[PDB]
Amino acid sequence: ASLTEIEHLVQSVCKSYRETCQLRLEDLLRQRSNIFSREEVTGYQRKSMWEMWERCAHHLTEAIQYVVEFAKRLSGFMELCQNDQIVLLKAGAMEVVLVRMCRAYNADNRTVFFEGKYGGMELFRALGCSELISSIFDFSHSLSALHFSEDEIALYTALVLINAHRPGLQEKRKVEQLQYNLELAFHHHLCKTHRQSILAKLPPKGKLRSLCSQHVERLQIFQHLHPIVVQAAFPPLYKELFS
């Protein structure tokens, strides 16, 4: 509701991002030339489906805990009723992980950081959901073409999370207010830094939603063949958000 207040909001979000980013951009960048060997790829590819799923679910969920800490730190988030917090997190946490992914992604060889090295799509073949992995690496690759800064990742992912159109919200108008101000902080930081050229370059909305649905669909097929794996082996937080 003030210019000075939104300058503070930019600062708030960026700093909150750094405290919850799980890994600093250059710890990712520095590890790019650590690439899984052919023999190490076939090791991953020899794990069962449920075993690759639970290793993947585990790592996703440790990433998601950082995202949850991040959301808690977004203005007004804790002053929303618990229903709506849960709604924003169920709809947004995975979206934020997909954006945070571009940091851990090397566009040069289309690899992602996983268990201490970089691997390609083939690293994930035992998951049995290969159109999805390809979609996710494509998204990540289009995102890298944007060349986001850390500050832009902060402000943008705050905005993916704080969205008043999420279905299931009770207090839609309280979150419109919250989102409006983060829209302002984001637009503000871009015109200050002479980006803003990237507003039309940004993904739809749709797109991320489509990525998320695909992940849930895939998980749901997985659960058909392994019902109690999800209920007993998967982290509870992952189970809670996704099924």
């Binding site: 805990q65 949850v68 917090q85 849960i86 997190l89 937080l237 809670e240």
Partner: peptide, 12 residues
């Protein structure tokens, strides 16, 4: 146990 989202949200 139940409801880990509730917990993460309540826990300072």
């Amino acid at each position: 146990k139940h409801k880990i989202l509730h917990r993460l949200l309540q826990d300072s």
